[PDB]
Amino acid sequence: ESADLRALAKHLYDSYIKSFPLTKAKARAILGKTTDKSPFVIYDMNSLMMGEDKIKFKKEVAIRIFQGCQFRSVEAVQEITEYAKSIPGFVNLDLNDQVTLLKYGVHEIIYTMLASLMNKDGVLISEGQGFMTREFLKSLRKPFGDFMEPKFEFAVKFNALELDDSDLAIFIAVIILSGDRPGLLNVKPIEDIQDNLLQALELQLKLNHPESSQLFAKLLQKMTDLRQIVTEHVQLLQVIKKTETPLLQEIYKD
Amino acid sequence: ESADLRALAKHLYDSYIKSFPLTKAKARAILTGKTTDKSPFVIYDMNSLMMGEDEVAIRIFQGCQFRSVEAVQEITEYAKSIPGFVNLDLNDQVTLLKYGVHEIIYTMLASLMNKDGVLISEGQGFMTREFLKSLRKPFGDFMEPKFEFAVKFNALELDDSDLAIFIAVIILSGDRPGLLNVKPIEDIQDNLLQALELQLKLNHPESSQLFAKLLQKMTDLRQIVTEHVQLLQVIKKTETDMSLHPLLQEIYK
Ligand SMILES: Cc1oc(-c2ccccc2)nc1CCCc1ccc(C[C@@H](C(=O)O)n2cccc2)cc1
Fold this sequence. Notes:
The first copy, chain A, has about 250 residues and is mostly helical. Chain A has helices at about 1-20, 25-30, 45-55, 60-85, 95-115, 135-140, 150-160, 165-175, 185-210, 215-240, 250, and strands at about 40, 120, 120-125, 130-135.
């Protein structure tokens, strides 16, 4: 029934709003033009120095930035974890499976949601208070110059679909309820749920983007691009391990 | 109009049948015991390999190469039948084939597989999964991920008419590295995706969201290709005397 799919769609949009403080609509207004404020721009080493001193950020510079992405990605995991629980049926799943789906899904959500904060020239930083340019990130080092580049390329491609928060809220849920995560114990109810969410997403895009033909298919094929980016992210973290050689190390276990 | 989509579905299926001599329907008939087709000789060890022939790890490897070269040429014929494909920039035609070819091969190879092995030699033979594992250190690994994919993919229970549209969709992907005109390619794929969407709903009415589940397999396919390339580079260096087929070299370049 199309009413229940629409009900599922709004539920999720309502949860998403409560879970994620900095929304795409907001990020876009900031990027985009709503000149009621302005983010501090970081475009080289000197602008970074002021960036710290001016707005509060709670060794080598290339390292210090990388460690900031870690801090922020840990914050995002809690936000995504909170959102997951609102997805109808998710908390009724076996607890090991809940943890499994969060464990593997979280990086895909992060880069998906990152794209909302990125344009072709840079990324909003620190609750949108800043803007780190793409050039500045390119110019970091032999290891750290390629950390963000693949994520900018995906964003450019992802953002060309012009999804909004109402669309994304349902896409994110689809991602979490992936029944192919390794080590899952009861795959059926996960797929039962994802199938329900895929119906709601399908209907969401049709009503919200009636002229955008086959957008559902294009977005689902963007799931390969997310998976490939996540794959080649740990491929950098393996090399970081052999370059960046205590109780904080524990907090950012992964 | 759906009628236009049904016409495209029919057209692609027809070309599929004309391009691929060993269909899934034929493959399944041979595997299950249908008396339309005849039973395969089974290769499960060295003597059974010696009998069927009436160093082996390399022999099997060069055998898979010859079959991929053969498949590439079949896939190339199929592609040309795809409305709009031959009208594309020639450079892109080659690029779409370069990256789409192996993804098609592993998709269609699933059709020839069950959990316990794979049809060979136009369905005359059947080589067991376990036998393929028992091969030399660098050659014992190549087929497993293909089997693990096939088991998952075959569970969707697509038929040749479904596969015909899906492989069309794979070929006309506008995200291939180095394409010149993404728009004409994506316009055609939209049309194909619509057709597939209608094909699946009609052909598999009781099968919820098969379209979405099918598209998500394109993830699994791309991983299979990367694992394989990695694994070929190991053999380049291990086996200095082993030759890869020119057509396969230029694809992997
Ligand atoms: C296990 C087996 O053995 C034979 C075979 C064929 C003829 C003679 C002896 C064995 N075919 C198969 C499997 C089906 C054919 C087949 C297998 C694998 C591939 C992928 C293919 C590729 O990546 O291009 N390849 C090349 C070398 C190793 C893999 C393409 C085609």
